[PDB]
Amino acid sequence: PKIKVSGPVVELDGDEMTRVIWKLIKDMLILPYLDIRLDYYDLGIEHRDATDDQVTIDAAYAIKKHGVGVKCATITPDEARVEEFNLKKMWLSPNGTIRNILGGTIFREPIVISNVPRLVPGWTKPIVIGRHAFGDQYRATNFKVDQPGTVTLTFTPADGSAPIVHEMVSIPEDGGVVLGMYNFKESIRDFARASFSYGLNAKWPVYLSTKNTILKAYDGMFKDEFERVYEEEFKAQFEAAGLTYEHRLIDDMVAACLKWEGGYVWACKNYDGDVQSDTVAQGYGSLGLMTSVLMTADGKTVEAEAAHGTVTRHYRQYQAGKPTSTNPIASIFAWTRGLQHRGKLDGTPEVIDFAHKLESVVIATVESGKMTKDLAILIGPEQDWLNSEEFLDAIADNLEKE
Amino acid sequence: PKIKVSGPVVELDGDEMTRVIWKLIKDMLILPYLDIRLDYYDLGIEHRDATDDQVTIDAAYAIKKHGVGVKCATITPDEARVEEFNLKKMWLSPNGTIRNILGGTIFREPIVISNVPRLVPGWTKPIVIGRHAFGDQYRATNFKVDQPGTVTLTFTPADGSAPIVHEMVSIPEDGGVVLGMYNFKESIRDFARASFSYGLNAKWPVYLSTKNTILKAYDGMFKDEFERVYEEEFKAQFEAAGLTYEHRLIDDMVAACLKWEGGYVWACKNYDGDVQSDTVAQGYGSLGLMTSVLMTADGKTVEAEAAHGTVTRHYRQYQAGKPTSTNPIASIFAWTRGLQHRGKLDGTPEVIDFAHKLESVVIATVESGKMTKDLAILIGPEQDWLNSEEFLDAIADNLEKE
Numbered sequence: 001p002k003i004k005v006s007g008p009v010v011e012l013d014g015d016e017m018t019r020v021i022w023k024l025i026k027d028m029l030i031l032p033y034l035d036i037r038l039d040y041y042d043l044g045i046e047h048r049d050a051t052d053d054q055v056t057i058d059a060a061y062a063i064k065k066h067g068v069g070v071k072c073a074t075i076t077p078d079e080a081r082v083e084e085f086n087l088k089k090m091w092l093s094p095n096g097t098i099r100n101i102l103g104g105t106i107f108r109e110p111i112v113i114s115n116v117p118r119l120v121p122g123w124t125k126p127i128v129i130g131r132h133a134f135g136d137q138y139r140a141t142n143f144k145v146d147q148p149g150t151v152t153l154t155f156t157p158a159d160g161s162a163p164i165v166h167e168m169v170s171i172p173e174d175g176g177v178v179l180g181m182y183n184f185k186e187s188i189r190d191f192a193r194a195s196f197s198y199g200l201n202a203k204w205p206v207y208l209s210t211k212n213t214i215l216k217a218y219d220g221m222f223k224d225e226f227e228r229v230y231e232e233e234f235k236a237q238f239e240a241a242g243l244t245y246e247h248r249l250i251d252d253m254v255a256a257c258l259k260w261e262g263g264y265v266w267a268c269k270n271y272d273g274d275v276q277s278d279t280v281a282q283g284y285g286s287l288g289l290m291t292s293v294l295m296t297a298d299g300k301t302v303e304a305e306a307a308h309g310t311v312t313r314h315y316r317q318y319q320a321g322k323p324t325s326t327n328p329i330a331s332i333f334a335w336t337r338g339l340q341h342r343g344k345l346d347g348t349p350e351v352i353d354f355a356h357k358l359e360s361v362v363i364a365t366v367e368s369g370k371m372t373k374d375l376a377i378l379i380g381p382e383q384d385w386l387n388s389e390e391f392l393d394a395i396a397d398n399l400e401k402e
Numbered sequence: 403p404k405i406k407v408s409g410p411v412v413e414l415d416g417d418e419m420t421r422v423i424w425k426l427i428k429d430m431l432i433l434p435y436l437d438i439r440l441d442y443y444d445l446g447i448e449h450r451d452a453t454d455d456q457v458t459i460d461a462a463y464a465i466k467k468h469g470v471g472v473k474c475a476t477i478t479p480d481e482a483r484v485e486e487f488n489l490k491k492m493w494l495s496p497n498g499t500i501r502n503i504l505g506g507t508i509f510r511e512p513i514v515i516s517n518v519p520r521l522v523p524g525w526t527k528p529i530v531i532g533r534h535a536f537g538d539q540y541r542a543t544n545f546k547v548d549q550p551g552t553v554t555l556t557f558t559p560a561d562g563s564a565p566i567v568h569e570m571v572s573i574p575e576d577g578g579v580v581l582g583m584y585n586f587k588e589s590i591r592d593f594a595r596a597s598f599s600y601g602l603n604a605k606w607p608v609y610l611s612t613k614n615t616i617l618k619a620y621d622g623m624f625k626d627e628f629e630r631v632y633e634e635e636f637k638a639q640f641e642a643a644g645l646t647y648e649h650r651l652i653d654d655m656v657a658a659c660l661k662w663e664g665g666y667v668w669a670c671k672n673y674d675g676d677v678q679s680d681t682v683a684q685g686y687g688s689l690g691l692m693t694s695v696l697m698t699a700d701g702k703t704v705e706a707e708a709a710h711g712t713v714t715r716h717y718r719q720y721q722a723g724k725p726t727s728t729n730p731i732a733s734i735f736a737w738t739r740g741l742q743h744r745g746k747l748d749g750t751p752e753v754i755d756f757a758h759k760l761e762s763v764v765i766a767t768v769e770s771g772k773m774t775k776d777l778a779i780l781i782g783p784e785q786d787w788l789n790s791e792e793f794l795d796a797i798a799d800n801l802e803k804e
C-alpha cells in the first residue's frame with residue numbers, strides 16, 4: 001500500500017509561500033503513497049542564518065553523495081532581506097553554492113497542459129533551455145572612460161613564451177565603454193556533456209546556438225567542443241535512438257523556437273540562456289508551469305526545483321489569514337522529477353510509475369477546469385479558479401481515486 | 403489633378419526580382435498619381451560595378467543633401483556573385499556604405515494585416531526594433547588559446563596618465579576563449595536620438611533594453627546616456643505627445659514582446675537588435691511584410707527599403723518566363739514611408755494622406771482575400787494566391803476607387 005523507495009532523497013526546505021505549499025505537497029501527495037527516506041535540510045532563511053549558511057553546503061554535499069535533490073524555492077539575501085530577518089551576513093545565493101559544489105548545467109523545462117493556452121499557439125511540446133552555467137558576460141571586466149585612449153587585450157602564456165598583444169581600438173574624445181570576457185574549454189565541454197545527457201534521458205534532440213559567423217574563434221570553440229563531445233561520447237547512443245544533434249546560428253534558433261512545436265533541448269551560451277529562458281517562460285504564461293533541473297555531465301546527479309521564487313506576495317496574504325491562489329505544479333513536478341531519477345538509479349519501476357501517475361493526475365485535474373488563478377487568467381475571465389488548498393485537495397482526491 | 407510633391411525624392415535602384423517589382427510599383431502606383439522629381443541612382447549590381455561603386459557614394463550624398471531616399475533591395479557581393487557578375491572587386495554592402503555616410507539607426511517596421519495570422523495572436527500592433535548601428539560584438543577582438551595563461555585588458559589614455567590595467571583571469575590548462583569589445587559615448591547618444599525621433603514620428607512610446615544588472619559600467623552608459631538625451635531633448639515633446647520612455651532589463655523586454663499587444667519602438671543594443679529582429683520577423687511570417695528604415699539622429703534624413711533581399715529564386719523563374727508570386731508590400735511601403743517624410747519636411751499634407759491611403763489600400767486589398775503565395779500559407783493549406791502582376795494589378799485597381 002506504501003510503495004517503498006530504496007535510496008535516499010535529499011529534501012531542501014525553503015521559504016515563504018513555497019514553504020507553506022511545499023509541506024502540503026509532502027503531506028497530501030507524497031507521504032501517503034511512499035515509504036521513503038527523506039534526508040532533510042532546512043534552507044529556510046532562519047536556519048541558514050542560524051548556521052551561518054553551513055546547512056547549504058551540507059545540503060549540497062548530501063545531494064552529491066546520493067544523487068537526488070528536491071528543493072523548495074528560497075530567499076536570496078539582499079539588503080532588504082538583511083533587515084527583515086536580521087541576517088548576520090549577507091549570505092550568498094544558495095543556488096549558487098549548490099551549482100558550484102555540484103557542477104552541472106541548469107535546464108528549464110516547461111509543463112504542457114492542453115487547455116491552458118500558450119501565448120504561441122503553435123507550441124505543443126516542451127522547449128527545454130539549458131544555460132551554460134559559467135562565463136561570458138557574467139564574469140566580464142567592464143568599465144567606462146570619459147576620455148580618449150587606446151585599448152589592448154593581452155594573453156600572457158604561463159610557460160613564459162611571448163605575450164600575445166591585441167590592439168583593439170582608439171576610443172575618441174568623449175570616451176565610451178570597454179568590456180573583456182572569457183570562457184574555458186573544460187567548462188564548455190562539461191556544458192555539452194550535461195546537455196547531451198539531458199537530451200538522451202528525455203529522448204529529445206539537441207541544438208546549440210552561437211553567433212560564430214561574427215565571433216569565429218570565441219564561438220567556434222562552443223561549436224567545436226559540442227561536435228567533439230557529440231561524436232566521441234554521445235553520437236552512438238543518439239543515432240541510435242532516433243535522436244540528433246545540431247549547431248545553429250542564434251538568429252535561426254530564435255526564429256525556430258517561435259515556429260517549431262517544441263520537443264528539443266536548446267543549449268544556449270550563458271547570456272542567450274538567460275534571455276531566451278524568459279521568452280519561453282512568458283510563452284507558457286506562468287512560472288507555476290516551469291521546472292529547473294540541475295543535471296551533472298554524466299548525468300548521475302539531478303536536482304529539481306520550481307523555476308519560480310517564494311511568492312512573497314502570496315505569503316503576505318497567507319500571513320494575514322487571507323486567501324491565496326498559489327500554483328503547486330512546478331513544485332510537485334520538482335518532487336516527481338526527483339522521484340523519477342531516484343527509481344531510475346534504484347531501479348524500482350513503481351517509484352517511477354508513481355512519479356508519472358502523479359504527474360498525469362495533475363495534468364488531468366487542470367484539464368477539467370480545476371486550477372489556480374495564474375492558470376485561469378490564461379484561459380479567460382469566465383474561468384473561475386481554486387484557492388491553493390482547494391487546488392491541492394482536488395489533486396489529492398483525483399489522486400486518491402487511484 | 404495629380405498630387406504635387408514639392409522637394410526631390412532620391413531613388414536607388416536595385417537587383418533581380420525586386421528590380422522588376424520595383425518598376426511595376428513606380429509605374430502602376432506612384433508616377434501616375436504624383437508629380438515627383440526622382441533623383442535617380444541605379445544601384446543594380448552592374449552599374450555599381452561600372453562605376454567601381456562610386457554610384458553608391460553618390461546616392462548616399464544625394465540622400466544627405468535632400469533628406470529623403472527610397473531604395474530597392476540590392477545584391478551584396480560575395481564570391482559566387484563576383485563570378486556570376488564578373489565583378490572587378492568585391493564591392494562592400496551598399497547598405498553599409500549608405501549607413502556610414504548618413505549615420506543614423508535602422509528600424510524594422512512590420513505591417514500588421516488583420517487576416518494574416520502572426521504566430522503570436524496577441525499581436526495587434528507593430529513591434530518596432532531599432533538596432534544600434536555600431537560596436538559591441540560586431541567589432542570585437544576574439545581568439546582561442548590552447549594553453550594556460552593570464553588575460554589583461556588595458557586602457558592607455560592619450561594623456562600619458564596612468565594606463566588602467568585590469569587583470570581579467572587565468573585560463574586553465576586546457577585553454578579557452580577571450581573576447582574584448584567596446585562602444586563609443588558619441589555613438590550611443592546618437593542611437594538614443596534617432597530612437598527618440600523615430601518613436602515620436604511613428605507616434606509610439608520608446609523602450610531601451612540592456613543587461614546593466616550585470617554589465618554595470620558598459621550598459622550603465624547606454625541607460626545613462628539614453629536618459630540624459632531623453633530629459634534634455636525629447637521628454638517635453640514626448641509627454642506632450644502622449645508618449646513615454648523607459649529602460650528595461652532585456653529579460654523583461656523579451657517577455658513583454660511576447661505578451662504585449664504591440665505599438666512601441668524597442669531600441670536594442672547591436673546584438674540584441676540582430677537577434678530580437680529575427681523573433682519579431684518570424685512571428686509575422688514573411689519579410690514581405692517588413693521594412694527597414696534608416697533615420698538620422700536629428701531626424702531630418704530618412705531612407706527606406708524592404709527588409710527582404712532581391713528574391714533571387716523568384717527571379718530565376720521570371721528570367722525563364724514562369725510565373726512569380728512576389729510580395730511587393732514591403733517595397734510599396736518603402737515608397738510610402740519616404741513620401742511620408744518628404745511630405746513632412748515640405749510640409750505638404752496631400753503627399754502624406756496619399757502615402758497613407760496607398761498603405762491602407764494595400765492592407766484592405768489583402769483583407770478582401772487577394773494576396774501573394776507568401777501570405778497565402780500563413781493562412782491555410784488553401785487560401786489561393788495571386789501572381790505578381792495579378793495582385794499588383796488588384797492594388798492599382800483598388801486604389802483607384804479613391
Ligand SMILES: NC(=O)C1=CN([C@@H]2O[C@H](COP(=O)(O)OP(=O)(O)OC[C@H]3O[C@@H](n4cnc5c(N)ncnc54)[C@H](OP(=O)(O)O)[C@@H]3O)[C@@H](O)[C@H]2O)C=CC1
Binds near residue numbers: 073077307308314325
Ligand atoms: N530558490 C529559487 O529558485 C528562486 C528564489 N527567488 C526568490 O524568491 C523571492 C521572491 O521572488 P519574486 O520573483 O519576487 O516572486 P516569484 O517568482 O516567487 O513570484 C512573483 C509573482 O509571480 C507569480 N507567481 C510566481 N509563482 C507562482 C505560483 N507558483 N503560483 C501562482 N503565482 C505565481 C505571482 O503573481 P501575482 O503577484 O500577480 O499573484 C508572484 O507574486 C526573492 O527573495 C528571490 O530571491 C526567485 C527566483 C528563484
Ligand SMILES: NC(=O)C1=CN([C@@H]2O[C@H](COP(=O)(O)OP(=O)(O)OC[C@H]3O[C@@H](n4cnc5c(N)ncnc54)[C@H](OP(=O)(O)O)[C@@H]3O)[C@@H](O)[C@H]2O)C=CC1
Binds near residue numbers: 478711713714731
Ligand atoms: N539590399 C537589402 O536590403 C538586402 C539584400 N539582400 C540580398 O538579397 C539577395 C537574395 O538573398 P536571399 O536571402 O536568398 O533572398 P531573399 O532574402 O530576398 O528572400 C529569400 C526567400 O524569402 C522569401 N521571400 C522574401 N521576400 C519575399 C517576397 N517579397 N515575396 C515572396 N517571398 C519572399 C522567398 O521564399 P520562397 O523561396 O519559398 O519563395 C525567398 O526565396 C542576396 O544577394 C543578398 O545579398 C539580403 C538582405 C537585404
Ligand SMILES: [Cl-]
Binds near residue numbers: 133134135138139
Ligand atoms: Cl560564472
Ligand SMILES: [Cl-]
Binds near residue numbers: 536537540
Ligand atoms: Cl559596427
Ligand SMILES: [Mn+2]
Binds near residue numbers: 653
Ligand atoms: Mn533571464
Ligand SMILES: [Mn+2]
Binds near residue numbers: 680
Ligand atoms: Mn539577425
